[PDB]
Enzyme design. Structure first.
Site, PDB file in Angstrom:
ATOM      1  N   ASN A 180       0.820  -1.207   0.000  1.00  0.00           N
ATOM      2  CA  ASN A 180       0.000   0.000   0.000  1.00  0.00           C
ATOM      3  C   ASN A 180       0.855   1.258   0.000  1.00  0.00           C
ATOM      4  O   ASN A 180       0.408   2.330  -0.408  1.00  0.00           O
ATOM      5  CB  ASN A 180      -1.011   0.014   1.171  1.00  0.00           C
ATOM      6  CG  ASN A 180      -0.400  -0.391   2.503  1.00  0.00           C
ATOM      7  OD1 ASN A 180       0.732  -0.028   2.814  1.00  0.00           O
ATOM      8  ND2 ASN A 180      -1.163  -1.127   3.309  1.00  0.00           N
ATOM      9  N   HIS A 230       1.074 -10.866   4.281  1.00  0.00           N
ATOM     10  CA  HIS A 230      -0.085 -11.355   4.996  1.00  0.00           C
ATOM     11  C   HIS A 230       0.356 -12.225   6.166  1.00  0.00           C
ATOM     12  O   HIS A 230      -0.182 -13.315   6.362  1.00  0.00           O
ATOM     13  CB  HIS A 230      -1.000 -12.154   4.063  1.00  0.00           C
ATOM     14  CG  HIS A 230      -1.820 -11.296   3.149  1.00  0.00           C
ATOM     15  ND1 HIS A 230      -2.825 -11.803   2.350  1.00  0.00           N
ATOM     16  CD2 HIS A 230      -1.796  -9.962   2.922  1.00  0.00           C
ATOM     17  CE1 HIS A 230      -3.382 -10.817   1.673  1.00  0.00           C
ATOM     18  NE2 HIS A 230      -2.777  -9.690   2.002  1.00  0.00           N
ATOM     19  N   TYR A 239       1.916 -10.065  -4.202  1.00  0.00           N
ATOM     20  CA  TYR A 239       2.140  -8.856  -3.420  1.00  0.00           C
ATOM     21  C   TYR A 239       3.577  -8.404  -3.678  1.00  0.00           C
ATOM     22  O   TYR A 239       3.876  -7.215  -3.646  1.00  0.00           O
ATOM     23  CB  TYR A 239       1.871  -9.127  -1.935  1.00  0.00           C
ATOM     24  CG  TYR A 239       0.390  -9.152  -1.628  1.00  0.00           C
ATOM     25  CD1 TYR A 239      -0.306  -7.974  -1.349  1.00  0.00           C
ATOM     26  CD2 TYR A 239      -0.337 -10.340  -1.699  1.00  0.00           C
ATOM     27  CE1 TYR A 239      -1.698  -7.978  -1.154  1.00  0.00           C
ATOM     28  CE2 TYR A 239      -1.722 -10.359  -1.506  1.00  0.00           C
ATOM     29  CZ  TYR A 239      -2.401  -9.176  -1.232  1.00  0.00           C
ATOM     30  OH  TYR A 239      -3.773  -9.219  -1.030  1.00  0.00           O
ATOM     31  N   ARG A 293      -3.282 -16.759  -3.820  1.00  0.00           N
ATOM     32  CA  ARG A 293      -4.640 -16.900  -4.336  1.00  0.00           C
ATOM     33  C   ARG A 293      -4.838 -16.365  -5.769  1.00  0.00           C
ATOM     34  O   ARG A 293      -5.893 -16.557  -6.358  1.00  0.00           O
ATOM     35  CB  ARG A 293      -5.646 -16.254  -3.360  1.00  0.00           C
ATOM     36  CG  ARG A 293      -5.485 -14.754  -3.131  1.00  0.00           C
ATOM     37  CD  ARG A 293      -6.660 -14.185  -2.346  1.00  0.00           C
ATOM     38  NE  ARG A 293      -6.880 -12.768  -2.624  1.00  0.00           N
ATOM     39  CZ  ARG A 293      -6.105 -11.782  -2.183  1.00  0.00           C
ATOM     40  NH1 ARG A 293      -5.051 -12.042  -1.426  1.00  0.00           N
ATOM     41  NH2 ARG A 293      -6.369 -10.531  -2.521  1.00  0.00           N
TER      42      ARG A 293
END
Length: 721
Positions: A180, A230, A239, A293
């Site tokens: 982020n 995560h 990510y 995922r």
């Protein structure tokens, strides 16, 4: 006015729009543009041109649904791109300019400003909408006054005042971390410039720098190249992606500011590229074991995702200068050129990117040689990636442990990845499409390649967990030889088994012992479930005699070997059993729809044919033992099977070992500190993982204790006889 700030905004514009690079001469660019043209068209025809309009577009009218605010501003941005593209029919069109200026005002007045509170999804008010606004204003800074630009960007600083937190205006603000942080730069760095505010600029960058560190625990990049996100999930491929892909987007700007980013931090980025990403790229493909995922997203299969990474690596090369720049250009180009299956250009969404690629691809001053062999032991994320440049193949070993989750299932994605980390292996060969074209929605999830499970049913609502043992790890002797082990226990604790892998230059040995089962379910190992090509069928030989496989299943007792033959040897696969085993095989059409593994995906039925090879385990204490040899012909496969005659040193509940007489290399796994004698040449004393090569009268020793994650002195674990 024209100053240093606008200079940075022109670079930004150059990276997001890049109308300067435009060339109606490759379907890629002319397509993208041909697309925006259409989009601006139906946007201009559908807009609500009234004096008391209650919104701007009926499809995105209800502004209580935050997604509607973001969508609205995105159409303005699309208008902003064309109005500034000399080749667009809307180039400098006063209707469009006026439309944006007026749309912005209306919105500022009735929908998005400092007076409103986050209603719906914060992401929209804090990242989605602010971005579209920065890019719309940045692109059309020549159709907006500075005064106006402050006015329309005041709302950004309202919802996003601090470069370290998101939702500071909600009752749950959080610290911006890793990924982020790139959005933070996309939102604040840009408005920082747009507003000619040096502090916001310097603060944001200082904060973006958080991500330029290497870690030793938790989320982030590691020294061995692993990357965790995560909490404890291996994620370099998703990510990790957004971190190098998004950051490569901001960097060029950051560096030309009065707050350049330290050189000791840049060198780290480089470490990520060579240590984290490069090894995960095989034949234009990004290995799935690192994508989490994301494997369940139809629009994001291996080769497609590999493009996010490469376009990022390229951005860095473009802004780097010395050898660095050149050695990275070679990396991108050799890898792009090695992908004959996917058109790299289909996944380059900006004219600059497409441009950079077409130039690289046609520059001869950039060497482009097929990459050399390599073996990555991402112990900090329990994954190993091997690549043999000689025979042209890649190998992925997917594990997990007490330090990592076996699989991620969230937001209704990857509903069935139960065993994609229970010893799953990936073989990347001549068929660059194997793990694509519906592989994920059609592969039998109860039989993932290389795993050991019971036929118990699993629920779509399950979520992953960590492993009980900390005894999972890899010992790398060199770039061709390594050994790994996993103290496996199944998801419901009704099955354990010692699983070991021996990577030996051009082949891998699979060993499993101590197979125990306490449930009533039947237990078995999946030797392989391979996705076949209708164009390239396989001819199967069992013990060198051809066989005709069934949709149902045939048992093949006293099996010594199985050979999958192709008209192309790079696709050939062979399996050698150190001890004749009883396996079963079949070939059948498997159907599945992406929705079954991902709610937000298409329910359109997908189908592929698969060859499945399994070995049942009927009694407690069973085991399996086979050597997987890829990329050789039947005659060479049969010769090598004669050579690995006594390659199996041992496969029991405390010791597992394979010997390569050709190389003079041993792969050993010890589960206890008993004294073990190998080949009557030496003894190994401690519980752990070893990979040993005899060099003359010497012995190069690579020892690793997966539980402590440290090595040890040769004296401590080894003894010459």
């Amino acid at each position: 006015v024209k100053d240093t700030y606008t200079d940075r905004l022109d670079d930004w514009n150059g990276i997001i729009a890049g109308n300067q690079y435009y060339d109606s001469k490759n379907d890629q660019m002319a397509k993208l543009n041909q697309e925006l043209e259409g989009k601006v068209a139906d946007s201009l025809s559908s807009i609500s041109s009234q004096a008391d309009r209650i919104y701007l577009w009926e499809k995105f009218s209800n502004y209580k649904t935050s997604a509607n605010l973001t969508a609205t501003y995105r159409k303005l941005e699309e208008m902003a791109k064309q109005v500034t593209n000399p080749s667009s029919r809307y180039y400098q069109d006063e209707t469009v300019v006026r439309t944006v200026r007026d749309s912005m005002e209306w919105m500022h007045k009735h929908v998005y400003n400092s007076e409103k509170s986050i209603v719906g999804n914060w992401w929209d008010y804090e990242i989605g909408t602010p971005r579209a606004i920065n890019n719309t204003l940045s692109l059309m800074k020549e159709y907006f006054s500075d005064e106006e630009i402050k006015k329309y960007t005041d709302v950004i600083e309202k919802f996003v005042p601090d470069p370290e937190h998101f939702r500071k205006t909600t009752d749950n603000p959080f610290k911006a971390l890793g990924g982020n942080l790139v959005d933070m730069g996309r939102v604040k760095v840009i408005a920082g410039l747009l507003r000619k505010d040096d502090q916001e600029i310097s603060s944001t960058i200082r904060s973006i720098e958080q991500v330029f560190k290497l870690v030793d625990q938790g989320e982030g990049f590691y020294q061995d190249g692993s990357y965790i996100d995560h909490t404890n999930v291996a994620y370099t491929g998703a990510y990790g992606n957004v971190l190098i892909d998004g950051l490569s987007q901001l960097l060029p700007v950051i560096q030309k500011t009065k707050n350049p980013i330290d050189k000791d931090k840049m060198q780290t980025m480089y470490h990520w590229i060579d240590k984290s990403f490069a090894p995960l790229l095989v034949n234009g493909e990004l290995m799935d074991m690192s994508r989490g995922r994301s494997i369940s997203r139809a629009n994001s299969e291996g080769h497609v995702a590999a493009v996010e990474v490469l376009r990022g690596i390229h951005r860095i090369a473009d802004m780097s200068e010395g050898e660095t720049k050149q050695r990275l250009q070679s990396l991108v180009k050799t890898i792009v050129q090695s992908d004959s299956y996917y058109d790299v250009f289909k996944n380059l969404k900006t004219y600059k990117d497409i441009s950079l690629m077409q130039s690289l691809l046609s520059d001869a001053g950039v060497a482009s040689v097929p990459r050399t062999s390599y073996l990555s032991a991402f112990n900090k994320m329990d994954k190993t990636a091997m690549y043999n440049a000689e025979k042209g193949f890649g190998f992925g070993l997917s594990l997990f442990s007490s330090r990592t989750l076996n699989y991620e299932h969230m937001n209704k994605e990857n509903k069935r990845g139960w065993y994609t980390s229970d010893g799953m292996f990936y073989l990347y060969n001549g068929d660059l499409s194997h793990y694509s074209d519906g592989y994920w929605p059609t592969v039998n999830p109860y039989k993932m390649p290389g795993t050991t499970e019971t036929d118990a049913k699993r629920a779509d609502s399950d979520t992953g967990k960590v492993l009980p043992s900390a005894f999972v790890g890899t010992s790398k002797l060199d770039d061709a030889n390594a050994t790994a082990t996993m103290d496996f226990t199944n998801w419901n604790q009704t099955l354990t088994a010692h699983k070991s892998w021996f990577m030996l230059k051009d082949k891998i040995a699979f060993l499993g012992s101590n197979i125990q089962n306490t449930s009533t379910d039947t237990a078995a190992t999946t030797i392989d479930q391979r996705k076949l090509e209708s164009s390239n069928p396989y001819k199967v030989y069992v013990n060198d005699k051809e066989a005709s496989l069934t949709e149902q299943e045939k048992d093949y007792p006293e099996t010594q070997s199985v050979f999958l033959e192709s008209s192309d040897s790079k696709k050939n696969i062979g399996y050698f059993f150190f001890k004749k085993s009883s396996i079963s095989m079949s070939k059948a059409l498997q159907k599945g729809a992406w929705k079954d593994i991902n709610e937000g995906q298409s329910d359109k039925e997908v189908e592929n044919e698969f060859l499945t090879i399994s070995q049942a385990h009927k009694q407690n204490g069973d085991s399996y033992g086979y050597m997987l040899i890829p990329n050789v012909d039947r005659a060479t496969f049969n010769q090598m099977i004669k050579e690995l005659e006594s390659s199996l040193i041992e496969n029991n509940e405390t010791l597992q070992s394979v010997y390569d007489a050709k190389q003079g290399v041993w792969g050993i796994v010890k589960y206890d500190d008993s004294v073990s004698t190998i080949s009557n040449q030496f003894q190994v004393l401690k519980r752990g993982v070893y990979t040993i090569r005899k060099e003359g009268d010497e012995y190069k020793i690579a020892y690793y204790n997966p539980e402590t994650q440290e090595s040890a002195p040769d004296q401590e674990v080894f003894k010459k006889l």
